[PDB]
Amino acid sequence: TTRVLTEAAVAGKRDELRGLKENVIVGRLIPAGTGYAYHQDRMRRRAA
Amino acid sequence: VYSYTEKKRIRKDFGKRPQVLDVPYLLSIQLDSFQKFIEQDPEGQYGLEAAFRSVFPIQSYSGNSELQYVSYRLGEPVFDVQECQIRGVTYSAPLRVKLRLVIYEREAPEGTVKDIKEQEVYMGEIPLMTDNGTFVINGTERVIVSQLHRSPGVFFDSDKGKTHSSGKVLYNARIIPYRGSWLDFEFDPKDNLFVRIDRRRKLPATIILRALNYTTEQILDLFFEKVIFEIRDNKLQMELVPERLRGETASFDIEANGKVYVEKGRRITARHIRQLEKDDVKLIEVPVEYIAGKVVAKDYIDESTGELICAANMELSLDLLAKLSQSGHKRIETLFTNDLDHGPYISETLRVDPTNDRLSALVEIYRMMRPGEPPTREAAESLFENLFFSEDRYDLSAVGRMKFNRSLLREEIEGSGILSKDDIIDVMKKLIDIRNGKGEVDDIDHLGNRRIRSVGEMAENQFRVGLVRVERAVKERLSLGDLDTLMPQDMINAKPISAAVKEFFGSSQLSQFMDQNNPLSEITHKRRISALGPGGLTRERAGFEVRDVHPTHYGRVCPIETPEGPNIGLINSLSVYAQTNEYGFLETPYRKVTDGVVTDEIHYLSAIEEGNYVIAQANSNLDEEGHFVEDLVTCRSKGESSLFSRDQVDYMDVSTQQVVSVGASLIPFLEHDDANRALMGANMQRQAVPTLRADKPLVGTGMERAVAVDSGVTAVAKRGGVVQYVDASRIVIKVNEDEMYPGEAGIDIYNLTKYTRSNQNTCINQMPCVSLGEPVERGDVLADGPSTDLGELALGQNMRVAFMPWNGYNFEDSILVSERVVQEDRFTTIHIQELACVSRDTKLGPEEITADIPNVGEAALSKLDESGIVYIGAEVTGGDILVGKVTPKGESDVKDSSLRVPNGVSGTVIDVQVFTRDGVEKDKRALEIEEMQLKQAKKDLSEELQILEAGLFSRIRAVLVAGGVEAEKLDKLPRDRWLELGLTDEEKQNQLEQLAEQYDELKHEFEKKLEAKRRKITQGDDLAPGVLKIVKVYLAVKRRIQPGDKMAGRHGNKGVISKINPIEDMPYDENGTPVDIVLNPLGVPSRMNIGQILETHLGMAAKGIGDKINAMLKQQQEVAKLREFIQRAYDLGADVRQKVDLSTFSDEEVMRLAENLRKGMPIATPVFDGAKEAEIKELLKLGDLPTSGQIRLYDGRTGEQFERPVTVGYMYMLKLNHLVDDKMHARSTGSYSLVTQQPLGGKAQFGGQRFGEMEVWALEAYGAAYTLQEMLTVKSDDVNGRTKMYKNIVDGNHQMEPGMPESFNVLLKEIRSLGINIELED
Amino acid sequence: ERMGHIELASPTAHIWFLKSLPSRIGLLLDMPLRDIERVLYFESYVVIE
Amino acid sequence: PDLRPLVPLDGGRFATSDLNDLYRRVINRNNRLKRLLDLAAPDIIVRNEKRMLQEAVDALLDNGRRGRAITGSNKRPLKSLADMIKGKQGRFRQNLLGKRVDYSGRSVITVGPYLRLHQCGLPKKMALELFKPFIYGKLELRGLATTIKAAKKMVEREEAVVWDILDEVIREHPVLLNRAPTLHRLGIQAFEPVLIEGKAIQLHPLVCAAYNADFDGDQMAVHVPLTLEAQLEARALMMSTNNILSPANGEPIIVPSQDVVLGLYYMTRDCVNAKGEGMVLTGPKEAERLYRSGLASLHARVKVRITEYEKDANGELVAKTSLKDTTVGRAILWMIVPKGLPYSIVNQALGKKAISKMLNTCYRILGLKPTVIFADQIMYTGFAYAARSGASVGIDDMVIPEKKHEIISEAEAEVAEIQEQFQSGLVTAGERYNKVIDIWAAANDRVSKAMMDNLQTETVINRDGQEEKQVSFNSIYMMADSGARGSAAQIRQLAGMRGLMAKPDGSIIETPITANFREGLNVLQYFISTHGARKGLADTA
DNA sequence: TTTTTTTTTTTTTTTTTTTTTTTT
DNA sequence: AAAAAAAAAAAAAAAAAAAAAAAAAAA
Fold first, then answer.
1. Residues B396, B406: Cα–Cα separation, whole Å
2. How many CB atoms lie within 10 A of CB B933?
3. Looking at the domain that runs over B656-712+788-827+1040-1223, which CATH code has it been given?
4. What is the b/e burial string over B5-31, where b = at least 16 CB atoms within 10 angstroms of the residue's CB?
5. Smallest CA–CA separation between C22 and chain A, in Å?
6. Phi, psi at C19, each rounded to 5°
7. Does a cis peptide bond (omega within 30 degrees of 0) precede residue D193?
8. Rounded CA gap, B1205 and B574, in Å?
9. With contacts defined as CB-CB under 8 Å, which chain B residues touch C1?
10. Are C16 and A2 a contacting pair at CB < 8 A?
11. What are the two backbone dihedrals, phi and then psi, of residue B399, each rounded to the nearest 5 degrees?
12. Residue D446 CB neighbours (<10 A)
C-alpha cells in the first residue's frame, strides 16, 4: 500500500470509481449486478 | 494377588505379550526436571547451585571488595496450593541466599582480608511445582510444556542442490552454541569458502583464520599437503608419492630408474600406481610445464638482495621459475590441488580475500558486526575476543561440547565451554572433507540432534538472566560505594530476579493454561513436546522437513498424536516409555539380547546409539527361555526394516505399546485403524467434558488405571489402613500400626474438592469410592475424580450404537440419539462459570456494594441479601442483579454499576468469594464467608486433636491401673485431674508428669494452629493498586444433550447430534431393548477407521456376558455357579496372561465382583497386542449373542423387520465440549465500535458475523448489488442510515438511504494525516 | 472530523517519499539514496547553488 | 482525537492507541528543538535534536522502516498510520472490503432431511433475535405496543403473541446461509427459514455438496436481507433452487451424494431369486402395494405395465404403454420420475453416475422446477429405502481372499531368490531394488484382483437349477460399487493387502506392509504407515 | 585507460477463513 | 507527590521482485 499510495500521490493520479472494488469500498452500488443499469443511467445523465 | 481396589472390578485382559516394564510414572519429565531445578547439589552442575556458581563470586572494579556466595535455602511457602488457588496468589517459595562480603587491603593483590560479613538475604520468589507437575501463578494452574530445539553443536547441512540453476550443492557447516552468537561456514557457486557470523553479511572464510594470528603460509600448511620439487641442475626433478597420481593423465613419460612405468597420453591406472608402489620410486623427473600453474606454498626471499622473489599463494609461471632458478633455490613446495580429492578451496578463498594482516581482518570484522562508527585498534580486538572466546558471552553448554566432539570424531567428551582455535580449524577441515567427497551431511531431524528442555532448564536460564542483571547492579553499586561496612542487603535488589522469573512463569509461548477438562488431557498436556517458543523455530518459519515423522521417532515420540491444523508435527507428544537422557536427548527402553537369550535387563538407548545396534520387534515369539522360536525375525537397524537372523539380533522392544503416546494408547483396536483417523481419535479424546456420572470404558486398552492414578485428580491413599470415616467432603484413614512412625499417632485426612471450576469451565468433583470400614492398601484409589470410575479413566459413556442409515437423519456424519440417552441423564455436564465485580476507589469517591440501588424495583433486589450480594443457591437467570454496586456520579447523585448475570447463562450461584484490601471494611456476606471458613477450620483442628488426646488419656489410665490402682476411683472424676496423681518411687514415677507436659504441648500446638489459621483467614488480602475489594460469584449451569452438541467416539469418528428421537421411534431388536444411537455406516469404509466396528462387536460381547451375570444374579441362585461362569469368562481366549483364578477370591469378594460387573464386564485390549478377531467370536458365543456380531433390528415406527441384519454393540462415546449454546448467537442492534463504526466482537460482546473479503466476492459473482450495497453500507458502517432503516422497518417501509460508509471517511482522514492530500471531486 | 496542525521548528523529510525503494527524492535529484540519507543524518554538507 | 480514542476502561484505567505516544514524542521533541534554538545552543546539540525530531516524525509517519521500530513500555513495535493503512489488519482489508454485519448470526448445523430444497431451518431463539425490528414494526402496526419500549419489553419477556408475529414475518423473507470458507459463489445461498425448536441451523442435505459442508461441527452464518430489493435478489438470484448448475462447469451441483445414492442403489437392483419373482403387475401402484405387504421382496424380477411419455411433438407430450421387464424396486422408483423422462433411465443398477445423469437428463428435458421437485423426491425416497434396507457393515463383510497367503508366499520366494542373486553379484543394488518393487506390485495387484473376484460376484444362489452367480450384496461392495462414500482404492486396504508406503524423502520402501486392516497391523507396519498420513495432513494444511 | 551489460548481492514484500527508577 | 523513555540484542524459512554495487569485455 505504501508503494501504490506514494506513486499515486507523486503522479497526482485520479481514480474515477469504475471497477468492482472502488465502488465496493466507497459503498456505492456495484457496476456488475443489479446496479448495472443504475450505473449506465449515471453515465447517461452525465454529459447530457 | 491383586490390589483391593482392583479386586473390586478386575478388567479382563486379552494381551498375549507379557509385560516386562510397567508403564513408568507418566509425569517423570516435569517432576524430575523441576526437582533438578531446586536441589542442594554438593557439586553444583544443575540447579540454582549452577547459576550461583556461574555468576558468583562478584568482584568490584578493582575496589578491593568482593562478594562471594555461600549457600541457598528455600523458606516454607507462606500459602499452600488450595488457598493459593482460592485467593489468587502464586504458590511460590522465597529463595534466600547466604552471601559473604569481604574487604581487602592495600598492597595485597591476593593478601588476607581485613573485614568480612555474612548475611542471609531474601532475593526473589520462585513458583514451586504442585504435586501433579503444575505451577500456580494467579489462582490458576499453568504448565510449562517441554521444548524441543535444535541441539547445540556442529551441523553439516547441505542445500540439496536448490537455490541455483546449475543444481549444485553448497555444503555449509554451522556451530550453534547454547548461548551466544552462531558461526556458519558456507560455500558458493564458485567453490569459495565463505563465513557469516551471526547470520550477518557474508565474508571469505580465511579472514577469521587471519584474525586468529595465522599467516597465509600457516593456512596453506594447515589445509594442504606439500609437494616437493627439486632442481638436480636441470630437468626440474620432483619427489613422487604414488597415491597422489590417482585421477590424473600422464601428459609425459612417467619413468624412473631407467624404466618407463607410464607413457604420455595414457591415463594413470590403479595397476600403474600399484606397480609404482612395488617399484619403490620416490623421486622422478617431470617437465617444467608441470609447474606452469602450480601455487607456491611459502614466501621466498633472494639471498643476495634480501628481496621477496615470490610470496605464498601465488601461481608459478615460467618467468618466475627462471628468475628463482639463478636465485639459488633448489627446493620448491607447492600445494597438491586435485579436482576430486584435494580441491584448492582455500587458495581461491585467499585470492578473493582482500585482507593482509591480523589487524586488517579485525577491522573488517568490526565494520561487519558494528558498521558505521570507526574501528579502533582495541575495539575490534576486544569485540572478537568477546564474541567466540569469552565465557561471559558465549557458552557451548556441554551438550554442545559433547555433540561438537562426537561429530568431529574426538576422544574426549568434556572440555571448555568456549570454542578454541583447534575447534574452528577442525570444523573447516571436516566441511572441506564433506565437500571433497568423504563424510556425509547430518540431517536436522534425527532425534539425536534435538534436545528436550524442561521446566528446569528454562527456569534455570531465566534465573541466570536475572542473576546477571543483579550482578550488574551490584557491580555498579560496589565500586561506587566504599566498604561503608554496608551489610550485603542494600547492594542486592530483589526486583530484577523476581520480575524475570515471574515474567517467564506467567507470560511466555510455553507457560500456558492447563487444558484441565479431563484426567487424560492433563496427563497428555504435561507430557507434551513443543517445537515452538523462544529459541526454537516459529510456525511460519518451518518447512516440511521438521513436520515429518523421521524414522527415529519410533519409541521416543508419538507418530499418530499431533494437533492437526496449522501447527502439525511441531507439537509432537511424547511416547509412553520415553525418558530424558542426562543430556536431554530422548532415550527409550530396549531389552538386552545375549548370545541367544533375551535377558530381562533393560537398556535405555538414545536416538544416536539406536542406529548402530540391531533392534527386533515387540511381537516376536519366544519359547519360555528368551530364545526366538523363529530363526528369522524382523528388525530395524539403521532406520530401515529387514528380516535378520536369530543370533544377529541385539535388542528387542520392551512392550508393544511404546510406539504411541499416552493419548493414543487408550484407543482400543488401534492396530486396525487408519493413521489419519487414529490421529483424529487421539486428538478428539482429550476434549471429552466430564459427564455427570462417568461410567466405564466397556472396551478399554488395559492402560487406563495408570492415567487416572498418575494424574493428580484421582487421589490415592498415601498409607494403607482401614477407613474410619467416609463423608462426601472428606475421608479419614487410620494407618496400620506397621506403617506408622513411632512418634506420631498418624491418621490421614483427605479433604476432597467439591464442584470447583476448572480452567475450561468444566466442573471437577471428587467423590468417595470406599465405604465405611473398608480396608485400603498403599497407593489405592479412594476418591474417584472427574471422569473416573473406581480408578479407571471414564471419558464418556458406553451406549448401544447401531450402524444403519436411518431416514437420512444421519446423512453425512450426524448421530441420531435416542431420548433414553437424555432421560437417563448420562451425558449431562456441569459447567461452572465465574463472574467478577471489582469495587475501586475513584477520584470522585470510593465505590460501595450497598444493597440499595437507585431506580430499580423490589423483585430485582429480592434475591440480594442485606449486603446486596446474591444468596448462595439462588437460581439466577439472564439479566439478574448479582452484586449491587454503585459509584459517584457528576452533575440521585450516584450511578448504578451493579454486576448482572450476562444474558443467556442461567445457573445456580454455588459459591461467593469476597476479597478485601488490607485495611478496608467488610460487608455482611464477607463476614458470613469469613465465619464459615473460621468455623470449618476450628472444627477440623478440634477433630484432629480429639483422637490424639484420647490416646494419651487412655495411656494415662493404663499407667494409673498399676502403681496406685484405681479400678473405680478413677473413672468417676473428670479426665482433667487424671494428670495430677502421685506415684511410687520407680522408673514410672517420671511418667505421669511427662505425659502431662506432652498434653500441655499438644494443647499449645492446637491453639497456635488455630490462631495462625484465624489470622490467615481474617487478614485483608492484597490486591492491585487502586482496587478496594473484589466480589466473585460462581454460577453452575447444567447442560443436557441437544441437536448441535458434538459427539465423537475414540477412533476419530465425530458428528453433530441431529435429533433426539422418542423412545419408540428408535430401532429395537426382538428383545425390546432399543438401540440408544444410530450412526451412519457409510463413513466407515471410506474413512477406513475399521477399528470402531471391532470395538462395537467386542462391546456387544462384553455386555452379553454382563447381562448373563445380571440374569444369574437377579434370582438368588448361588455363589458356586457365579464362580463357575465368571471363571469360564476370564479363562477365555488363548495364551492370555493374568491367570485370575477365583479360588483365592473370597466368596463375598466374588459377590462384590458380580455386583460391579453386572453392568457389563470390562475388556482390556492392549494397543498393538490386541484381541484377535477369533477370540471375539468365542466371547460372543460365551453368552448367546450371534457370532457374526449382527442382530436383526425391527424398525421403530413402521413395525416391520429390517432386511439384511444390522450391527449393534456397546461403543464408548465421549461428549466433546463444542456445545451448541456456546456457539449459537445472533445480533440485530448490538452496540457498535468507536474508531470505525461497526459491530463488535462475537458472542460475549453480542457482535454480528464477518462479511469478509471472501464473502463479498460470493455476492459479486451473483448479480447481487443491492444486497452487497446494504451489507457494507447500512448494515454495518453508515452512521445515520442504519437508524433510518430501523425506523422504516418499524414503520413497515422496506427501503434505505445508503449514504457513505463511515469507515471510508475514517480512511480519508487517516490518509490526510500523512502528507498526502485526498478528496472527493464531483 | 476536526484536525490540527503541528508547526515544526525545522523542515522534516517524508519517509514515504524518501525510503520507498524507487525513492522519489532519490531519483528526482539523480542523487544516490545513500548520499541523501547521509545528508539527513547531518553527516556531511552539500553545496546549494 | 476520536480516531485515536482515550476511553477510560471500567475502573479508572485508560486504554489508548499508539498514535498518541508518537504524537506526544513529536511535540516534546519539537518543543525541545524550539527551546534549543531560542537558547542558541551549540551546533552539536541543535543538530542532535533536529535528527531526533526527524526520527520521531519518521516513526509517526511510518514506524519500523528507517532504523529499528521504537517500542513503548510493552516492548513491541508500536503501530503508526502506515500500519493502520496497510496489512491484513488495515482499514482496506478489515473495515472497507468487508466488515462485521448486523442482523446476522451463526451456529452449528444438522441434517434435517424433511426440508424441501429451498428452505433451511432456523432456531426459534436465533430467529427471534435476528428479525427483532421486523417484530417491533409488525407489533406497532397491529397496535399491541403503545410505544417502542413496551414492544421491546414484551419481546424480551418473550410473550406468546410474538410467535404468531414472527411466523407471519418469516413466511416470505429469505435468509442467506454462508459457510466460513466461501471459495466460490455457491458458498452463499438464500433459503426460506423454517422455525425450529433447539439451537441448530438445520440445512437441506443436498446443498452440502455445493457448500462442501459436512456435519462434523462445521459452523454456518445466517444473514438477513433487509431492503425490498435485497429480498427480491435473494428470491430471484441466490435461492438454492435457482443454483442447480455450477458456475465452473455445465454439470449439476445437486448430485445425490452418499446416503440417498446407497438407498437408490439397493432399491434399484435385482436378486436372481427373491420372494415373488416372475409375476405380472398392473403398474407401479401395484408394485408398491405388493412391496409394503411383504408379499414380494423389494427387488425381484417381474413384468410391469408402464406408460412413458415423450415430447417428440411440437411441445406436446404423447404417452406409450408397454409391458416392461424390471424389478419391483424400479417399479416403485418410477412413480417419482416426472412425466417426460423415459423408463430406461431407471432400469439399471443406478449408482452415483447413473443417478446424477438421470438428474441432468431431467433438467435438460423438462426445465428447472420439475428437476427441483425430482431432486427432492429422489432424496426422500433414497433416505427412506436406505433405512428400509438396514444396510450395515460388520466384521464379516471384509472377506479376505482365500489365496492371499499363497500370493505372499510366492512374493517372499521371489524376493529371496533375487536377494540370493544379489549375493552372487549378478544384479546390482538398483536393479534388484527395481525387481523387488516390481514383484511386490505384481503380487499386490494379484491379491487385489482375487479380493474383488471373491467380493463382487461371490454370492451364488439357485433358481430351479443347480446354482448361478450374481453381483454380490456384501455391504462393503454395495457401498463401493454404488460410488456412495467408497471406491476400489479405499477398499483393498480392508481385505487385501494395503500395498506399499513411502518414506519422508518420497522413496518407496523395499518391503511393503502385507497386513490389511481386517487383520490388524503390527508395530513396524503401522509406524511405516504414518509417513503417508502426516505428509497428507501437512500438505492439506 | 572510460563505458555498457550482465551478473551478483542486499533488501523489501507475502505467507487462508472463522472462533521502573528517575525529572518537574 | 505528577510525569517519563535507554539499553546489549540476536536471530531465524521460503520464495520472488526490484534496486544498487561489482565484474566482465571491450575499443
1. 14
2. 17
3. 2.40.270.10
4. bbbbbbbbbbbbbebeeebeebbbbbb
5. 9
6. -115, 0
7. no
8. 43
9. 1305, 1309
10. yes
11. -60, -30
12. 18
- Coil vs helix vs strand at B721: strand
CB atoms under 10 Å from CB of D266, counted, come to 28
Burial B1216-1226 (b: 16+ CB within 10 A, else e): bbbbbbbbbbb
Burial of D278 per CB tally in 10 Å (0-12, 13-18, 19+): exposed
Cell numbers that stand for B1060 in this block: 433426539
Which cell numbers hold the place of B519? Answer: 484426567
Cβ count within 10 A of residue A42: 13
Residue D290 C-beta-side C-alpha neighbours within 13 Å: 25
Residue keyed to cell 502439525: B568
Measured CA to CA in angstroms, residue B176 lies from B693, D162, D495 at distances of 53, 71, 50
Instruction: Report d(CA D250, CA D265) in Å as an integer.
Output: 25
Residue owning grid cell 430499580: B856
For B205, residues 6+ apart whose C-beta sits below 8 A from its C-beta are B185, B193, B194, B195, B346, B349, B428
Question: What angle do helix axes B48-55 and B455-480 make, rounded to 10 degrees?
Answer: 30
Contact assessment for residue B757 and residue B830, using Cβ atoms and an 8 Å cutoff = no
Q: Please report, in range form, the residues annotated as the binding site of D.
A: 214, 216, 218
Here the cell at position B433 is 572433507
CA dist B1133 and B1139 (Å) reads 12
Torsion of CA B528, B532, B533, B535, to 10 degrees: 120
Q: What is the enclosing helix (H) or strand (E) of B927? A: helix B924-961
- The dihedral built from the CA positions of residue B666, B672, B676 and B681, taken in this order, carries a sign that is negative
The gap from C-alpha A3 to its chain's centroid, in whole angstroms, comes to: 20
Q: B506-511: long-range contacts at Cβ-Cβ below 8 A with a sequence spacing of 24 or more?
A: B506/B137, B506/B138, B506/B142, B508/B144, B508/B533, B508/B534, B509/B533, B509/B534, B510/B144, B510/B145, B510/B147, B510/B458, B510/B534, B511/B135, B511/B137, B511/B142, B511/B143, B511/B144
Q: Is any atom of nucleic acid chain E found less than 7 Å from the CB of residue C20?
A: yes
Residue matched to cell numbers 479508572: D12
Report which residue type is found at B649: V
- CATH number 3.30.310.50 given to B828-920+1021-1039: no
Instruction: Give yes or no for a contact between B871 and B825, defined as CB atoms under 8 angstroms apart.
Output: no
Interface test with A, best of C14, C16, C28 (most A CBs within 10 A): C16
Cα–Cα distances (Å) from B843 to B857, B885, B895, B1027, B1035, in that order, read 29, 16, 15, 12, 32
Helix (H) or strand (E) holding D376: helix D369-389
Nucleotide nearest to D65 (CA to C1'): E12
To the nearest whole Å, the CA of C49 is away from the closest chain D CA by 22
What are the residue ranges spanned by the domains of chain B? 25-151+444-574, 152-224+343-443, 225-342, 575-655, 656-712+788-827+1040-1223, 713-787, 828-920+1021-1039, 921-1020, 1238-1322
C21 touches strand E (CB under 7 A): yes
Fold entry, domain B152-224+343-443: 3.90.1110
Query: CB burial class (10 A; 0-12, 13-18, 19+) of residue D392?
Result: buried
Check residue B615 and report its DSSP letter.
B
Task: Note the strand F nucleotides within 7 A of protein beta carbons.
Answer: 4-5, 8-15, 18-21
Give the containing element (helix H, strand E) for B1302: helix B1302-1313
Strands D175-179 and D188-191: antiparallel
Q: How was this structure determined?
A: cryo-EM
Fold equal for B713-787 and B828-920+1021-1039: yes
As given in the structure block, the three cell numbers for residue B523 are 496427563
